[PDB]
Subunit: 294 residues, 4 copies
């Protein structure tokens, strides 16, 4: 046996960060100490682990195959030291979250997780669903909390909770004061202010509300929940937004919700992990925590 746990950690860090420089800071080694370690691993194994893309290092065919094995070896070693000293030692997680989850759930969730584990190391990256999927796919994230569809076969979609979107408008919109239940045909000429194409929130509108209003008027598309709601509340215009974002403004008399039972505005929120990623003590403790928010 030539390889060392330090070398495996460098191999993992380079796969997570993309360069020896970024990887060296993540394992707390000088840059040439890290490059010596990676070179020793590759020379000992008799093959390179990364294709050299001029600048970035990207896992090659062998590196991809070996990466999950390295993560399991490192995770068991962490479990080893834990199982001796008798409790959760080091937590080091790279997390991702989509826009609505990060605005209205992540701050409380991470703060509460750090009250219980004051020593936990957590990185947070925010993006849309497909940016999260690709990050988990590249082993760049340990876990992502997503609000969009979940359909990649090598990734695992663990249902976390359901999120209710709603059609909202200004309190003085004519449809809010209508003396009869609403119909889909009442929204034919509404001006919609929606989330960007490709986001999970926009998915719901396109797959639930666009069917009935195929010529829906959509001039404003914003990748920001608050900007949408301030414009909707600033006069006419409607949006289909998570109740997580609307309800804080319903308290301030800025918005109302229209009853639209003819449209299914559910969506599932998911925890996204790689099916091959060994779940060491760190990750697993965080997943259960997220689940135990029953």
């Amino acid at each position: 046996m030539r390889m060392t746990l330090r070398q495996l950690a460098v191999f993992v860090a380079v796969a997570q960060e993309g360069t020896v420089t970024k990887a060296s800071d993540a394992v707390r080694l000088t840059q040439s100490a890290a490059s010596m370690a990676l070179a020793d691993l590759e020379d000992g194994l008799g093959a390179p682990l990364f294709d050299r893309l001029g600048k970035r290092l990207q896992l090659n065919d062998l590196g991809r195959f070996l990466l999950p094995q390295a993560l399991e070896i490192l995770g068991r070693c962490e479990a080893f030291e834990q199982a001796a000293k008798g409790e959760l030692q080091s937590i080091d997680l790279r997390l991702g979250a989509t826009l609505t989850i990060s605005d209205y759930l992540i701050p409380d969730l991470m703060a509460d997780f750090l009250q219980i584990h004051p020593q936990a190391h957590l990185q947070l990256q925010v993006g849309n669903t497909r940016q999260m999927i690709e990050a988990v796919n590249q082993f760049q994230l340990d876990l992502a909390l997503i609000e969009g569809s979940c359909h990649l076969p090598q990734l695992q979609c663990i249902h976390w909770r359901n999120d209710e979107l709603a059609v909202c408008c200004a309190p003085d919109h004519p449809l809010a004061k209508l003396g009869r239940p609403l119909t889909a045909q009442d929204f034919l000429n509404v001006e919609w202010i929606l989330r960007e194409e490709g986001s999970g929130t926009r998915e719901v509108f396109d797959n639930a509300i666009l069917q009935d209003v195929p010529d829906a008027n959509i001039r404003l598309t914003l990748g920001h929940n608050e900007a949408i709601l301030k414009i909707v509340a600033g006069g006419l215009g409607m949006s289909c937004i998570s109740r997580l974002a609307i309800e804080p403004l319903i308290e301030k008399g800025q918005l109302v919700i229209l009853e639209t039972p003819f449209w299914e505005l559910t969506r599932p929120l998911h925890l996204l992990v790689h099916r091959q990623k060994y779940q060491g003590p760190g990750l697993k403790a965080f997943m259960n925590f997220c689940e135990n928010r029953v």
Copy 2:
């Protein structure tokens, strides 16, 4: 067939004037060129558009049937030229904004802009300064409101306003309880909860504070302002973040600002456009609107 606008103009002028000579004067042409134009049109259509009775030209049934088509074509060519010369475009902007700007300035700014121009088409993308520079450099955005450096010669970085950052901590942080004024040395072993490498907020910290705390304990790196403040108020460490984000928490007694006059925590905010990209009237209206915003 290969007809021309000139031929349509002569066709219409003859329809309105009755003679080639007066038609040629209307459309600013020689009698020979106008006569030639009408003949080319009729030969292209393969049938006459006028009955010929001496020098006078009278529309025949075909002429009367095609005249409104010609008038519409000529009318829309004039609208085309006027719309271009007068730059009569509607507002149709693809905008970009960095995190702190998007969170605390974009909502009211865009809401107030849409009050004046409620029919404007706008798209907004949110990301990091580096992500915005690339978008603007690829001609994917008309304008970006960034909170970071911009050292690019092909891009034009216009100064918008200033953003004041501050060091904040939970009200009972040991450093918050000191009597004397603070010094940079007091911060050597602070646990820093910071924005990611590549953000402009992290640029302020790296530029000002790191010179005095070389091995600063970067306890956490989070790409979310509120997550940072929640964790700092919860009792873990400090952050260097915009006073726009801190203030509502100061008002609620969840964060305090530590005086650090030995550190310059002022940052410029910039309007970022591509020097080679045409600027329409909508972009110029939004840029002037941003410039005219209070501070």
Copy 3:
């Protein structure tokens, strides 16, 4: 009026081809005549119509606003030329089509249309639904026949016809021998041979089947309908694919369809056009042929 139909046609072709050289071939002008046509148009209008990305030309704010007007001016000229002669001068269509449509419907469609209008100029682009939507979005296509979902606001989708997909397998598959009708549970542990993630066929499996076998083994993902069907028939494994592609093999005895009434596998096919594109005589003639070809 200094601008000409020739210049408008160049302006359109550049928007559709992306370079002057490719535009000059589309409008059958030399490179020089084409570049001079665009430059003079821009000079007269007092502003450029395209942003320059090197040799790439992409419409700028003013160009995007004026392009629909140019298309309408040229279409009305096509209509003028035909209304006087009685017959369709130019049919000149840039068409798009998704794979299943391109594999089993377009071939006999264009061949039959070209027998009715033997003078038409047709160009056929092929791709998945995301590309046809983008291609049409840029005005690079007059019309696309798509098999996926239609969600961009600036485009319009006319319901063309329906297409029924079906789970299929080799005749000797264990699930094809059972006597008791099948359940969603029988399909646990099946090896799936599916189309690529960004296709309308994979869209049906992802939203109509995947929610019942979430751990569904998806070992092979192929952007080719025939490759899938040959692999499925050559051993075990199944796919969910259009009956247009399966049924030649079902009647050959190389595949069978498993009845799956617990899954909705019907999906619409659409005609896709830009809402801002003027529908001239040629285009409107083709759209009518496709409508009058269902039943």
Copy 4:
């Protein structure tokens, strides 16, 4: 981690041997080197892993609890090393192909490959030669089968096989019903239905046929081999297309290939890879499989 695989190996050996001496030989290590390692391990855990009897070393309770964990870690490290040294990874390939290749060669090529390697993971992207070039240049693909021309030096181009394309027409076309050897001039006035520019099949009309036909009415341009042939059979014109595509129509009487010996019309099909991309056992398997057909 302050613990090392070396420490684990020594912790296992003493458990299997019982004395530091024999445990040192079976790990191929000096006595001092091995005793130093066990000292560090018990240090960085907080407690000892053995009871001492002069120097008989039998597992105390802690050692018995952690030993099976040490054996599993060491076993996975050994498996990790044999997997790497022997390149025992599975097949996980991202493949590309041009249109004629995808339509007429890929279906039975991939199906037969999967009869040999049934658990292989394959992905297929279909697109013209220049998309595949860039895809392989961007590491978006492990291999591409291209019917076009190779240009780049940091790409490796490997001759796969030759492809003969021919000029095809409708059987009742006047030129076909003629009883005379055709000439390059008998084509001067005829309708040509070609594939898109910048494509493999296009190269052969623009490099071989466009040297002899002056008018050369490029009546159309379609990026679909079949649509071209359905049209050509409807009575409209001719095309210079791969014979792999034509012969299916010939068995049905819809197309006839014309005699045209004054035009070469041979074009090579190539395997395309990147010179700096590590080739695992899966890629070499598929590449050799292609070459042996």
